[PDB]
Design a protein around this ligand. Structure first.
Ligand code: GLU
Ligand code: NA
Ligand code: NA
Ligand code: NA
Ligand code: NA
Ligand code: NA
Ligand code: NA
Ligand code: NA
Ligand code: NA
Ligand code: NA
Ligand code: NA
Ligand code: ZN
Length: 867
């Protein structure tokens, strides 16, 4: 069952493989793989070649065409001894795509065959040096039944093709860029193809090809459009062009993650490709955009420069997430992007950094590498890259990117290499900054202020510390870029300065405790603190309600207005959760409701921003405010708050809802912002007088000319338990049952229902005609949404949620351990809950620990959780 691997153990490989020639005789039941690799020894003469392989049937081994006798198979490996220094290795083996339920390696997605090799899936295809610092030039020949698999795709360009007897054919591909094997891809199947072209700024014409299941071609143009937008943006912002002749994307229905950046042949979860205005929401459109961009941006940050080892995952993922965010932000509402990314950081990643699974963005220890494709590596990773950007500014940051590619193009690099490039290009010292790579947990930054009217000085006294996490007992101060702005009482910025000279508004918070003194502060300021969430930290500062509403009215950056609103609410969320636990109803000062009233009626606020201020923090974001989480109190308080605001703001809500009506549906940023505001008003309106609400919601649902508006109405019906809910839910089922992606939204609504009988409805749905345990998207929509997005039901006092999740994980552990491990995450958070909950959650985890054939993926999490 073991065994953890450790970053500090990295060693350069004893052998390299420079070129690999693959042939697949493809069949669902039995695929024959022939792999001819050119190998070179780099380590000691007597070192055996250790190849990784899993679930392979070895047929033969030859070395320079000599059948080899000096080898043995061991657990996960083929160990070949007594080799020359350079030689040709030839392996023949068999695998069975149809048996592959874990969806790693070569597997079946409906009638298609496709691959997923990151992290360590290639070893499920043949015996190989399945480690990302081994880089080979691939040539791939695919042979298959012509009728079942008319399209035979791999990385690169087509260099040969032929027909064979018995209705077979083949295509051979060649990719000139050396690659680690996690970037190998193969697809075989029968597809509709949308083809288009992008012309790079230096005049290279790239053929673009999007492969979708037959009948899905009508849902492809947005994705193709987003790809072109991605290519253009990476040229304009980063100076990067695509480096091949063709760019293929294949949308498949059975896929564990969102998508995969395989060189020239990305494979996508169809969730992040398929859109039409009646099937997909504005959010889907902007997610498709994000993820198409992300995989495209990987071509440089990931493919042209790869990872020395898997502990360096954030080198590509943090950076590529930063890039997808800058892309979304440049194209759309930068404020909305930042706000949402901050909501994700505070509401979801902070929770992980306080969990038993906590790790630094560059982990030190890993048992199952698929457990480290995390909010931390990705989202916190990007926040770290963004801190570098904050510290260097754009021009220097882009010089660091240039030095990074100039030094590392065509190699496997480390996080440390990236930091060094940024430091050397910029001349900004990032020694201390590197500690963000090696330390887990969320720093807490404590600020106290003092204004001195005699000296006309404002002084901030800033402290930091990070609590211990289960993985690390010593913690040390980080280099926290801590952006401020100071406002006079009319809302003007006060120049920051000291002893005659300008001071940078990004303060360098590097120690446990420091003081910063600003001079020439003629009037007592109101500060904005941690502007743009300039570091991924908790901020402890004793805001007055009035300072916060002042900021809501006057802060220069849209984000600071939002964030001031969140700090205003936070006090009253905490108040009312304590009240709720004593049986006391919601209490909200009049002046708080008035601050949201003012936002509804301020004509000068960008509606994109108004919408976000009028979107209350989620139950996950609310949970981050507390030492011990009470999910039932949080959920009832969020409901009560919503009903309070609905009552107090009813007329203003209706007015803004009506004013933002749009007869034309467009996927355009201004339109989206208006719709988002409209629908934010709708959420409150749904909790007004019952009949009025029922009529308004039902009308939106029935008269919508797009899925954004239909879903928002259905969601509101569900959330407020309106009388129309059952009829609208049944209508959506009747209309959409045949469409998995669209039914996923309905599964989410079912799983997150506040109805008393939600669990029972969810169990029933395991037999629904649109549900299947074979499909990860369906799993995550129904089961995962219950456990992870309905904490109130998941954490029902009778413990029924935990038992339900145990039953589901008991199946998934064997079927698909990666989706199992995603779904176990809520149970591993047990120590945030009260003792009675902890006790039932430990018991659920102890049941799981006892499973016959416990996957490594779950073993890792369960062990940390029970510690
Ligand atoms: N492969 C990623 C998603 C997309 C990406 O990181 O490139 C994951 O498995 O979570
Ligand atoms: Na071959
Ligand atoms: Na073996
Ligand atoms: Na990836
Ligand atoms: Na990559
Ligand atoms: Na923008
Ligand atoms: Na595994
Ligand atoms: Na994976
Ligand atoms: Na809000
Ligand atoms: Na949380
Ligand atoms: Na906008
Ligand atoms: Zn990625």
């Amino acid at each position: 069952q073991p065994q953890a691997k450790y970053r500090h153990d990295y060693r350069a490989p004893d052998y390299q493989i420079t070129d690999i020639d693959l042939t697949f005789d493809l069949d669902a039941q039995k695929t024959v793989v022939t792999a001819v690799s050119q190998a070179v020894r780099h380590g000691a003469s007597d070192a055996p070649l250790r190849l990784n392989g899993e679930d392979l049937k070895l047929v033969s081994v030859h070395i320079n065409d000599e059948p080899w006798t000096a080898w043995k198979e061991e657990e996960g490996a083929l160990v070949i001894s007594n080799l020359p220094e350079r030689f040709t290795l030839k392996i023949i083996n068999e695998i069975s795509p149809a048996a592959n339920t874990a969806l790693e390696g070569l597997y079946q997605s409906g009638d298609a065959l496709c691959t997923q090799c990151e992290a360590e899936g290639f070893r499920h295809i043949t015996y190989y040096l399945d480690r990302p610092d081994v880089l080979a030039r691939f040539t791939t020949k695919i042979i298959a039944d012509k009728i079942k698999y008319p399209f035979l795709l791999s990385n690169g360009n087509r260099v040969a093709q032929g027909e064979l007897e018995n209705g077979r054919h083949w295509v051979q591909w060649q990719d000139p860029f050396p690659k680690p094997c996690y970037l190998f891809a193969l697809v075989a199947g029968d597809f509709d193809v949308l083809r288009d072209t992008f012309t790079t700024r230096s005049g290279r014409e790239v053929a673009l090809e999007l492969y979708v299941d037959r009948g899905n071609l009508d849902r492809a143009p947005w994705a193709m459009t987003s790809l072109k937008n991605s290519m253009k943006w990476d040229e304009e912002r980063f100076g990067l062009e695509y480096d091949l002749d063709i760019y293929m994307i294949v949308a498949v229905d059975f896929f564990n993650a969102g998508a995969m950046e395989n060189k020239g042949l990305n494979i996508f979860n169809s969730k992040y490709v398929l859109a039409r205005t009646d099937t997909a929401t504005d959010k889907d459109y902007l997610d498709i955009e994000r993820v198409i961009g992300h995989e495209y941006f990987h071509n440089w940050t990931g493919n042209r420069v790869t990872c020395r080892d898997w502990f360096q995952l954030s080198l590509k993922e943090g950076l590529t997430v930063f890039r997808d965010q800058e892309f979304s932000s440049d194209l759309g509402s930068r404020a909305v992007n930042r706000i949402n990314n901050v909501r994700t950081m505070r509401g979801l990643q902070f929770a992980e950094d306080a969990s038993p699974m906590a790790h630094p963005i560059r982990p030190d220890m890993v048992i199952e590498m698929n457990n480290f494709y995390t909010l931390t590596v990705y989202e916190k990773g990007a926040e770290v890259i963004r801190m570098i950007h904050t510290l260097l500014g754009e021009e220097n940051f882009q010089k660091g990117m240039q030095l990074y590619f100039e030094r590392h193009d065509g190699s496997a690099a480390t996080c440390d290499d990236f930091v060094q490039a940024m430091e050397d290009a910029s001349n900004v010292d990032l020694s201390h900054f590197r500690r963000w790579y090696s330390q887990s947990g969320t720093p807490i930054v404590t600020v106290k202020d003092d204004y001195n009217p005699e000296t006309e000085q404002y002084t901030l006294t800033i402290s930091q510390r990070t609590p211990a996490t289960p993985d690390q007992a010593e913690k040390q101060p980080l280099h926290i870029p801590f952006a401020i702005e100071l406002y006079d009482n009319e809302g003007k910025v006060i120049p920051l300065q000291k002893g005659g000279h300008p001071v940078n508004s990004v303060l360098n918070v590097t120690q446990a405790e420091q003081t910063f003194v600003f001079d020439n502060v003629y009037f007592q300021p109101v500060p904005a603190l941690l502007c743009e969430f300039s570091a991924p930290v908790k901020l402890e500062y004793k805001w007055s309600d009035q300072q916060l509403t002042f900021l809501m009215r006057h802060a220069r950056n849209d984000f600071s207005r939002w964030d001031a609103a969140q700090s205003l609410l936070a006090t009253y969320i905490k108040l009312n959760v304590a009240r709720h636990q004593q049986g006391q109803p919601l209490s909200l000062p009049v002046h708080v409701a008035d601050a949201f009233r003012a936002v509804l009626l301020d004509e000068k606020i960008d509606p994109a921003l108004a919408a976000e201020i009028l979107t209350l923090p989620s139950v996950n974001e609310m949970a981050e405010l507390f030492d011990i989480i009470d999910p039932i109190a949080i959920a009832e308080v969020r409901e009560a708050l919503t009903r309070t605001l609905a009552t107090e703001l009813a007329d203003e809500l209706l007015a803004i809802y009506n004013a933002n009506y749009q007869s034309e549906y467009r996927v355009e940023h201004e339109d989206i912002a208006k719709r988002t505001l409209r629908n934010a008003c709708l959420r409150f309106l749904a909790f007004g007088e019952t009949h009025l609400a029922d009529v308004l919601v039902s009308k939106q649902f029935h008269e919508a000319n797009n899925m954004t508006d239909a879903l928002a109405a259905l969601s509101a019906a569900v959330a407020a338990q309106l009388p129309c809910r059952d009829a609208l839910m049944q209508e959506y089922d009747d209309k959409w049952h045949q469409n998995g992606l669209v039914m996923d939204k309905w599964f989410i609504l079912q799983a997150t229902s506040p109805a008393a009988n939600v669990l029972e409805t969810v169990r029933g749905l395991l037999q629904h005609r649109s549900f299947t345990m074979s499909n990860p998207n369906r799993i995550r929509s129904l089961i995962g949404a219950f456990a992870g997005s309905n904490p109130a039901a998941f954490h029902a006092e009778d413990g029924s949620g935990y038992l339900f999740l145990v039953e589901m994980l008991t199946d998934l552990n064997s079927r698909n351990p990666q989706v199992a491990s995603r779904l176990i995450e809520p149970l591993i958070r047990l120590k945030r809950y009260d003792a009675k909950r902890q006790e039932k959650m430990r018991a659920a985890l102890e049941q799981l620990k006892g499973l016959e054939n416990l996957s490594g993926d779950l073993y890792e999490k369960i062990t940390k959780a029970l510690a």
